[PDB]
Amino acid sequence: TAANNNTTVFVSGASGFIAQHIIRQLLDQNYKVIGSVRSTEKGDNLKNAIFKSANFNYEIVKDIADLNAFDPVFEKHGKDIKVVLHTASPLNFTTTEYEKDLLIPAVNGTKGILESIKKYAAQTVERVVVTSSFASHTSTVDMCNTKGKITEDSWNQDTWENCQTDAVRAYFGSKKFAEEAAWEFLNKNKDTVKFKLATVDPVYVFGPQNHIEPGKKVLNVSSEVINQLVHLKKDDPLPQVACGYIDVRDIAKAHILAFQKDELIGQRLLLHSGLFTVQTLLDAINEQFPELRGKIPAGEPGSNKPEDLLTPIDNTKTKKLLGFEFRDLKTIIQDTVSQILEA
Numbered sequence: 001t002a003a004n005n006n007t008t009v010f011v012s013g014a015s016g017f018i019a020q021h022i023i024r025q026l027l028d029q030n031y032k033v034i035g036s037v038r039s040t041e042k043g044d045n046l047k048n049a050i051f052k053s054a055n056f057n058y059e060i061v062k063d064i065a066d067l068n069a070f071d072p073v074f075e076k077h078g079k080d081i082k083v084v085l086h087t088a089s090p091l092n093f094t095t096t097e098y099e100k101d102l103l104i105p106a107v108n109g110t111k112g113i114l115e116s117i118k119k120y121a122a123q124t125v126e127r128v129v130v131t132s133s134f135a136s137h138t139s140t141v142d143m144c145n146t147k148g149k150i151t152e153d154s155w156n157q158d159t160w161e162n163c164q165t166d167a168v169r170a171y172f173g174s175k176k177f178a179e180e181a182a183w184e185f186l187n188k189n190k191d192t193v194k195f196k197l198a199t200v201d202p203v204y205v206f207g208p209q210n211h212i213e214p215g216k217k218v219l220n221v222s223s224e225v226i227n228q229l230v231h232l233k234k235d236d237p238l239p240q241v242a243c244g245y246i247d248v249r250d251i252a253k254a255h256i257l258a259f260q261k262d263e264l265i266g267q268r269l270l271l272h273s274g275l276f277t278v279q280t281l282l283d284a285i286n287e288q289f290p291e292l293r294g295k296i297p298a299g300e301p302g303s304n305k306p307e308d309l310l311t312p313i314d315n316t317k318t319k320k321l322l323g324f325e326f327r328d329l330k331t332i333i334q335d336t337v338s339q340i341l342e343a
């Protein structure tokens with residue numbers, strides 16, 4: 001606790017779902033934290049209402065797509081920042097402007113923050129963790145091949161051009177190219193910068209919000225999947241959603257281990273606990289919250305098993321490297337849905 005509080009951690013996109021959980025666990029370990037936010041309203045909310053700690057401060061970085069967006073942060077604080085967790089990237093399916101709104105901010109946000117480290121903190125930052133995604137390991141078009149296999153070594157095969165069929169496949173591409181850019185940065189700057197890099201690459205991230213916001217009927221994208229199911233009417237049509245799941249608090253823990261442990265240097269950490277279709281989620285919600293039974297859809301129990309749909313995922317290497325057991329779906333669903341209901 002004494003050694004940790006000598007260390008300042010910079011976290012991009014501090015107001016987001018995953019980043020708040022990261023910052024929560026950083027403050028639990030007595031680290032000092034600087035987070036970037038896009039507005040004073042968001043920054044004040046974090047410092048005044050959520051963390052309430054002298055170990056948390058914020059800075060405004062309005063748009064990560066911008067040339068030199070992170071230069072003022074590292075000019076001011078570069079001498080004190082030993083760890084950088086770059087988590088900020090647009091996750092939104094509501095745009096048709098795939099390059100302007102997804103691909104370019106993802107890539108230039110990642111290139112930009114690393115260039116700013118080189119410019120103002122080349123010998124000060126020891127460790128960087130980039131939040132990548134399962135999307136960087138597979139395109140949407142290769143996610144549902146039961147005869148394939150995804151591992152830490154798998155890369156999304158899409159091109160800048162062909163991922164632009166729709167906002168989901170384009171967002172998947174944005175993660176791929178941004179992660180590629182982070183490793184390429186070290187490829188060309190091995191002798192210019194001290195920091196070592198690792199990436200945390202999650203599947204769909206569920207779990208409780210770090211802080212309930214009274215008037216938010218729309219959560220972040222991954223969390224809004226469960227929010228929708230809880231509020232569907234019994235006869236409503238079912239969304240189509242299928243992937244791996246992982247709990248947000250396991251994601252936060254993995255980000256912190258990824259800068260503390262030396263065996264995680266240079267690793268792509270594939271964070272994944274189990275497979276789901278919407279039926280998997282409906283079965284779990286109905287089972288664990290019987291007060292929703294007959295109020296939300298039941299789907300067709302016994303149908304649409306994710307094993308018969310999705311490409312298998314082998315992340316046994318990541319599990320051994322991290323050395324902790326991931327929360328299972330029943331835990332995730334209990335913690336997530338109970339918080340929604342309590343609000």
Ligand SMILES: NC(=O)C1=CN([C@@H]2O[C@H](COP(=O)(O)OP(=O)(O)OC[C@H]3O[C@@H](n4cnc5c(N)ncnc54)[C@H](OP(=O)(O)O)[C@@H]3O)[C@@H](O)[C@H]2O)C=CC1
Nearest residue numbers: 013015016017018063064087088089090133204205220222
């Ligand atoms: N949730 C999931 O299932 C997964 C998430 N990820 C990655 O995790 C990270 C966080 O996503 P998550 O927490 O899930 O979703 P959130 O939407 O909660 O967090 C997104 C964050 O990115 C910030 N942001 C987006 N675009 C910009 C921009 N152009 N300039 C500055 N800040 C920006 C948002 O700022 P504001 O708060 O102002 O919008 C927000 O803080 C992202 O890199 C995402 O790709 C990876 C795999 C799965």
